[PDB]
Design an enzyme around this catalytic site. Structure first.
Site, mmCIF file in Angstrom:
data_model
loop_
_atom_site.group_PDB
_atom_site.id
_atom_site.type_symbol
_atom_site.label_atom_id
_atom_site.label_comp_id
_atom_site.label_asym_id
_atom_site.label_seq_id
_atom_site.Cartn_x
_atom_site.Cartn_y
_atom_site.Cartn_z
ATOM 1 N N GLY A 178 0.657 -1.259 -0.126
ATOM 2 C CA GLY A 178 -0.017 -0.023 -0.163
ATOM 3 C C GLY A 178 0.845 1.022 0.073
ATOM 4 O O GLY A 178 0.494 2.361 -0.432
ATOM 5 N N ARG A 215 7.418 1.641 0.518
ATOM 6 C CA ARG A 215 7.566 0.061 0.842
ATOM 7 C C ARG A 215 7.910 -0.416 -0.567
ATOM 8 O O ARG A 215 8.679 -1.592 -0.549
ATOM 9 C CB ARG A 215 6.217 -0.506 1.182
ATOM 10 C CG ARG A 215 6.608 -1.607 2.238
ATOM 11 C CD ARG A 215 7.174 -1.294 3.345
ATOM 12 N NE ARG A 215 8.214 -1.853 3.995
ATOM 13 C CZ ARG A 215 8.898 -1.693 5.137
ATOM 14 N NH1 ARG A 215 8.404 -0.714 5.973
ATOM 15 N NH2 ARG A 215 10.100 -2.157 5.428
ATOM 16 N N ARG A 251 1.932 11.373 -8.854
ATOM 17 C CA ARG A 251 1.122 11.667 -7.378
ATOM 18 C C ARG A 251 2.219 10.936 -6.112
ATOM 19 O O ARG A 251 1.543 10.574 -5.214
ATOM 20 C CB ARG A 251 -0.228 10.753 -7.350
ATOM 21 C CG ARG A 251 -1.246 11.731 -8.083
ATOM 22 C CD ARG A 251 -2.476 11.078 -8.243
ATOM 23 N NE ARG A 251 -3.533 11.817 -8.976
ATOM 24 C CZ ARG A 251 -4.394 12.709 -8.421
ATOM 25 N NH1 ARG A 251 -4.530 12.656 -7.038
ATOM 26 N NH2 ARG A 251 -5.272 13.402 -9.110
ATOM 27 N N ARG A 304 -1.178 -8.359 -4.069
ATOM 28 C CA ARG A 304 -0.928 -7.400 -3.128
ATOM 29 C C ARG A 304 -0.026 -8.066 -1.860
ATOM 30 O O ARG A 304 -0.601 -9.271 -1.466
ATOM 31 C CB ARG A 304 -2.386 -7.027 -2.431
ATOM 32 C CG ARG A 304 -2.404 -6.351 -1.128
ATOM 33 C CD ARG A 304 -3.867 -5.706 -0.647
ATOM 34 N NE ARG A 304 -4.009 -5.680 0.571
ATOM 35 C CZ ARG A 304 -3.200 -4.841 1.326
ATOM 36 N NH1 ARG A 304 -2.160 -3.879 0.730
ATOM 37 N NH2 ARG A 304 -3.379 -4.770 2.745
ATOM 38 N N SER A 306 -0.419 -5.575 5.338
ATOM 39 C CA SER A 306 -0.560 -5.954 6.489
ATOM 40 C C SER A 306 -2.006 -5.968 6.913
ATOM 41 O O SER A 306 -2.941 -5.331 6.283
ATOM 42 C CB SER A 306 0.110 -4.536 7.488
ATOM 43 O OG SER A 306 -0.344 -3.524 7.448
ATOM 44 N N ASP A 357 -1.319 -6.254 14.090
ATOM 45 C CA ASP A 357 -1.828 -5.818 15.270
ATOM 46 C C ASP A 357 -3.237 -7.074 15.594
ATOM 47 O O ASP A 357 -3.645 -7.668 14.630
ATOM 48 C CB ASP A 357 -2.306 -4.481 15.568
ATOM 49 C CG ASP A 357 -3.480 -4.075 14.576
ATOM 50 O OD1 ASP A 357 -4.767 -4.468 14.740
ATOM 51 O OD2 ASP A 357 -3.164 -3.513 13.590
ATOM 52 N N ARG A 409 9.566 -8.661 13.614
ATOM 53 C CA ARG A 409 8.334 -8.294 12.601
ATOM 54 C C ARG A 409 9.090 -8.169 11.108
ATOM 55 O O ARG A 409 8.355 -8.395 10.304
ATOM 56 C CB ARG A 409 8.182 -6.866 13.111
ATOM 57 C CG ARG A 409 7.252 -7.098 14.435
ATOM 58 C CD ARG A 409 6.408 -5.502 14.866
ATOM 59 N NE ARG A 409 6.730 -5.114 16.235
ATOM 60 C CZ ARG A 409 7.496 -4.138 16.501
ATOM 61 N NH1 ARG A 409 8.262 -3.671 15.581
ATOM 62 N NH2 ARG A 409 7.558 -3.758 17.684
HETATM 63 N N1 LIG Z 1 -13.812 12.320 -13.720
HETATM 64 C C1 LIG Z 1 -13.518 12.096 -12.565
HETATM 65 N N2 LIG Z 1 -14.150 11.110 -11.846
HETATM 66 C C2 LIG Z 1 -13.707 10.825 -10.615
HETATM 67 N N3 LIG Z 1 -12.767 11.439 -9.868
HETATM 68 C C3 LIG Z 1 -12.147 12.455 -10.484
HETATM 69 C C4 LIG Z 1 -12.353 12.906 -11.843
HETATM 70 N N4 LIG Z 1 -11.507 14.060 -12.351
HETATM 71 C C5 LIG Z 1 -10.986 14.201 -11.054
HETATM 72 N N5 LIG Z 1 -11.208 13.382 -10.001
HETATM 73 C C6 LIG Z 1 -10.345 13.505 -8.720
HETATM 74 O O1 LIG Z 1 -9.066 12.952 -9.288
HETATM 75 C C7 LIG Z 1 -8.584 12.297 -8.576
HETATM 76 C C8 LIG Z 1 -8.682 10.785 -9.156
HETATM 77 O O2 LIG Z 1 -8.091 10.484 -10.484
HETATM 78 C C9 LIG Z 1 -9.473 12.173 -7.062
HETATM 79 O O3 LIG Z 1 -9.350 10.829 -6.517
HETATM 80 C C10 LIG Z 1 -10.710 12.722 -7.561
HETATM 81 O O4 LIG Z 1 -11.440 13.407 -6.651
HETATM 82 N N1 LIG Z 2 -6.878 -2.754 11.665
HETATM 83 C C1 LIG Z 2 -6.799 -2.306 10.638
HETATM 84 N N2 LIG Z 2 -7.990 -1.995 9.655
HETATM 85 C C2 LIG Z 2 -8.038 -1.703 8.618
HETATM 86 N N3 LIG Z 2 -7.089 -1.779 7.520
HETATM 87 C C3 LIG Z 2 -5.843 -2.229 8.369
HETATM 88 C C4 LIG Z 2 -5.594 -2.557 9.650
HETATM 89 N N4 LIG Z 2 -4.482 -2.925 10.017
HETATM 90 C C5 LIG Z 2 -3.781 -2.848 8.910
HETATM 91 N N5 LIG Z 2 -4.602 -2.251 7.731
HETATM 92 C C6 LIG Z 2 -3.979 -2.087 6.433
HETATM 93 O O1 LIG Z 2 -3.275 -1.058 6.657
HETATM 94 C C7 LIG Z 2 -3.323 -0.110 5.780
HETATM 95 C C8 LIG Z 2 -4.231 0.889 6.246
HETATM 96 O O2 LIG Z 2 -3.621 1.721 7.343
HETATM 97 C C9 LIG Z 2 -3.926 -0.746 4.521
HETATM 98 O O3 LIG Z 2 -4.574 0.157 3.776
HETATM 99 C C10 LIG Z 2 -4.750 -1.919 5.286
HETATM 100 O O4 LIG Z 2 -4.998 -2.933 4.508
#
Ligand SMILES: Nc1ncnc2c1ncn2[C@@H]1O[C@H](CO)[C@H](O)[C@H]1O
Ligand SMILES: Nc1ncnc2c1ncn2[C@@H]1O[C@H](CO)[C@H](O)[C@H]1O
Ligand SMILES: Nc1ncnc2c1ncn2[C@@H]1O[C@H](CO)[C@H](O)[C@H]1O
Ligand SMILES: Nc1ncnc2c1ncn2[C@@H]1O[C@H](CO)[C@H](O)[C@H]1O
Ligand SMILES: Nc1ncnc2c1ncn2[C@@H]1O[C@H](CO)[C@H](O)[C@H]1O
Ligand SMILES: Nc1ncnc2c1ncn2[C@@H]1O[C@H](CO)[C@H](O)[C@H]1O
Lengths: 233, 232, 234, 232, 234, 233
Positions: free
Chosen positions: F20, F24, F43, F87, F90, F204, F213
């Site tokens: 994610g 990493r 981004r 994927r 964690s 956790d 870990r």
């Molecule tokens: N045509 C579209 N549909 C959905 N999200 C759009 C969009 N044009 C811009 N966004 C915004 O840009 C990010 C996703 O690429 C942001 O995550 C999102 O808010």
């Molecule tokens: N206690 C929890 N609840 C939800 N997501 C958890 C989690 N512990 C780990 N994850 C994973 O870590 C990222 C979000 O912090 C990742 O996005 C997610 O997959």
């Protein structure tokens, strides 16, 4: 008195007829009841009490829609000792063999409202009328020489629906008429332990002559009133 | 003339104030309007048209519940040239700091009704008012020295709800007032292309059970004055 | 022949009685029907046709649950000209005033199944029986000196539900008995234009009787169903 | 320090501007802030704090999607004393008259996400912004001579949606811009007790397929200037 | 004894094979099991217990539909110590590359039933099989020179659905076969902590074979299921 | 190039590992891949390509949440020729017998998101991994002497959930770990015809020593990489 009805226990009979239009309630009282008196006028929702062939009976409008009629029927049942509610209204037809001026009796009522799901833990609650009341109305109709269809009604939340395709669905599953209250009233009756019935005359086919239409509306009222007397026996 | 209104194009002004109680509409016509005339009484839903400070204005009741007001607002918009709808009703408070007589302006409206899901493919449609109309009402209020909160209202289908726990959720999320029409009116305005705003006067408190004509006078004046500002 | 019924048009009467337990079908045929003949054996769901006081009648089990009875009722209606379906089974009660061995008639049927929502665009379809069939059963019962309750049934998808709280709700709204098919059959009847009714005897109270008492009650239910058909012919 | 932010109480200002792109946050810190310092970079989600016209302000990215921004906005509110969140992002237009570079202010936000139904007992919660913040942005815009529409936004879970017909429904109901965070941010602000507003710059058109740094400058200035007005 | 199974702890093995058709149960017992003995007859749902290459095995039908199989699997697990359930049935295909008589293994099962949403607070529960049982079946099939597809099945509540459009959706998402029980059994297995697997043979293509070809394919499925149990014991 | 990835066909291998955290992804590339080069930075979502024991392999972050990882996996599959997505993340544990540093393999993934209902006409779509990939990972783990649990994961939309009671439900139905992406990725793989798998280490229990870990996180990566080689045969 209650939030929407300014009257006291005893002012209403244990059986109440309810059209949607308050002016219709006054029309019913003047046309069919003897020694009738107005017992409510809050928000203009006229209610009356008098007698029919010696039997004490009341009639009051309930407004349009499930939210509206739910308030009034609830108050009548919990604060005025009412045991039976008979809605007397109009509906639009979806079935081709269902003709103008037919009298429809809602043994059950489908709906696109969420009120019964909210009551029944998001499951399917079958909103039905009281069996004995349905029977009394069918018998009263036969005694008057009238043909009455017994089946499902559909209580809609939107008179001006954006989903026109739902009418083909209603027709496919045999819905006899479309109105806006039955499902709500049946839900209230089940929640508070009372009895209810909805009777309608077909006003449109989703109109003939005024004389013939007005004659049929009166037959419906006669059916309602006479069904009560049969129930008393 | 439409199925629930016996009048003709021109009988209503392009702006209409709407209380749920038809008797309050009459009270408003007699108390705030100039040369008021009745333009409807089908099903007893009284409607009137007159003038306020030389401005043509109408006032008509809409009944209780989303299904009832959806019929009247729709007919007004599609067959009487009405451009703005301002609901002027009452509501019940759920927050501790909201007192009786308080004036609330619903920029948004939550609901437990299914009408908007039916219009929006079962998704979440944010039922909101017209921004300019909201701003107009806030300013009018200030000019009159009257307080008014702006926020979310909750439009309920059941006045007598079997789920009392939902009031805790409403309170938790800052609901200012509980009524029965807002979300419905906002949905109709969006579907048929008009503008709307709901203003309410807290007339009862759901927690304390306290209960309250004339009590709605500040609200009514804010509504009428906001229209004038909108015209400029 | 259909996927689950190896027979031809005419093999079944226009009225069919249906118990859940397949074994009850042969019992009904030999105990109440005259000149009975076998008309189906697929998957062991035995079907029979004969006459009751000169009236042509058929009987065949439907299996447990909405999905099962929905298959059989649909095929009988669309491929064998069946006009009426009468389910005769047992149910469990939640109301204190409803007693063991009581006879209940489901004018309507609630459910936690999704089948009717799939049919009705996700709205509420009131699954109901044919009114005349309901009245016929009530009158037939009275003529036999039997008292029957008419109201709502609840058709459960899970006999062993993880939500015990739902029984309190059913009691609050006046549900007379809990079974597993009524709402499914009523949906099929509306979908393909036929008539249906469900009659049940309280076999237990969600909260005893002799083996002889149970046969007496069962035989009473069948007599009611059968006599109700004849009244309907009038 | 929280699970996704390595900083301490005091590192962030009480107001935070948030774009989805962390690189745009950096651009904003370098282009509009005075003496900007980095206060976070865990998972690459850059955060900065500096001054604008003597006013202390922070800017940090929130990632794409309601699930991503819900984590950051929550942590900022409960562990860093942040009182106002202003999303400054991009969106796609669906209406014919909405052009690229247009600035939209979401007074409300519709969504196909389930997060608000989970908070609101499966009912309809109207996800709305703080009225004062909306008014502040409208005024700032006017003072800068920049146009800006106020209305509903739509927060989608799927950028690549399998339901293309839903765009017709969005258009039908007047959706100004399609993005992916608004409804989520508004839900968090209500649950944890803060205030929020989402402002966007149309960067693409869903129907025409037209595509567009520096393009967000008018939006960014409206955001910063609206805060100053809010302080008075 | 339970409401639908008249037997006692010990009467059933810890592994039970279950066909939909009750008549298939006696056939499996006489064709593949040694020293078989009858252990149930309630409602005509015959059950048998015997051994396969010295391993204790039971077989009993489950009926058509989620509600029916949910009753039997639940009772076997909570009252007869059953640890594994292997459904052996037939299905209909929507994918062009999936052929009649093909053997498919459901690692997962989609559904239009509401049972799992009721169990999972109205969220999405991925109804899955036990991984080792899936791998055991795959390996047993290969040893028999048979090629089996592993993927998603779809458990329908309505054999006769009013929504034909749903089949296009199933094809788009790669559904291998359409039946009526898998998702129900997987839900019960998770609820009461047991293991389950569904194996099906394509009997038709939603869009022929000799009676002898069908018995050959059916016997192949049973051999796979039985040999898969032994691999699992290793 | 695509809206979120500034690269060209060929820049990625036909198999992509996805943590994610973008930092990493860089950590994985520097630690396990030879001759690695950065192929994306839009981004800040770093992506890389290099080789493992001669096999071409890529690794790129996917951000947090279903909406985020859905964008990236979709683009990789439809515009860069990617056939497999693994994927590597964690999760938090709900079962008591599930211990810290256990390696969990998501054969399936439950969720409280609406994305798959939107895809599957409001019905229940069982979001599952590709069987062969699951098998390769179980075998690779065994070859390394590691114990891997195979079962259901739960992909949540809200890390900070208002509904605390849902954790008792997850535990009751045997969910092995809680994360935020599996269900979304499996939905994308089914919609566009590709293959996916999610592997997690328990971080956790809804933490021991850093050394132990970090050792387990590396075993997970080794399992992923070696499972690919097995698949190639
Ligand atoms: N045509 C579209 N549909 C959905 N999200 C759009 C969009 N044009 C811009 N966004 C915004 O840009 C990010 C996703 O690429 C942001 O995550 C999102 O808010
Ligand atoms: N206690 C929890 N609840 C939800 N997501 C958890 C989690 N512990 C780990 N994850 C994973 O870590 C990222 C979000 O912090 C990742 O996005 C997610 O997959
Ligand atoms: N076509 C239609 N659709 C919905 N309701 C209809 C109707 N025709 C008649 N009704 C009944 O009339 C009132 C609403 O105008 C009553 O409120 C309603 O029961
Ligand atoms: N406590 C409360 N709950 C629901 N509606 C309330 C209310 N207090 C006032 N209203 C408004 O008054 C009418 C219903 O009596 C109007 O229909 C409604 O808007
Ligand atoms: N307590 C109960 N709950 C649910 N169904 C019950 C029941 N008592 C009787 N039935 C009927 O018996 C069969 C299921 O065992 C039939 O399938 C069902 O109609
Ligand atoms: N085309 C199809 N649709 C649904 N179920 C099918 C099927 N083909 C076979 N089955 C299986 O056969 C029984 C239902 O007839 C079993 O109950 C079911 O698993």
């Amino acid at each position: 008195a209650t939030p929407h009805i300014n009257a006291e226990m005893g002012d209403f009979a244990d059986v109440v007829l309810m059209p949607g239009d308050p002016l219709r309630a006054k029309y019913i009282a003047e046309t069919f009841l003897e020694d009738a008196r107005e017992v409510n006028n809050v928000r203009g929702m006229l209610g009356f009490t008098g007698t029919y062939k010696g039997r004490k009976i009341s009639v009051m409008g309930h407004g349009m829609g499930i939210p509206s009629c739910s308030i009034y029927t609830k108050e009548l049942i919990t604060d005025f000792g009412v045991k039976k509610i008979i809605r007397v209204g109009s509906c639009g037809a979806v079935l081709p063999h269902v003709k103008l001026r037919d009298v429809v009796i809602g043994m059950g009522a489908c709906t696109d409202s969420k009120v019964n799901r909210i009551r029944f833990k998001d499951h399917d609650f079958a909103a039905i009328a009281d069996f004995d009341m349905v029977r009394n109305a069918v018998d009263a109709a036969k005694a008057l020489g009238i043909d009455a269809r017994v089946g499902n009604l559909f209580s809609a939340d939107l008179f001006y629906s954006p989903d026109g395709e739902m009418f083909d669905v209603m027709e496919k599953y045999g819905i006899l008429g479309v109105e806006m209250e039955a499902a709500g009233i049946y839900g209230v009756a089940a929640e508070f332990g009372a009895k209810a019935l909805t009777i309608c005359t077909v006003s449109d086919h989703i109109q003939t002559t005024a004389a013939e239409r007005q004659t049929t509306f009166n037959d419906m009222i006669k059916i309602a009133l006479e069904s009560v007397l049969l129930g008393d026996k």
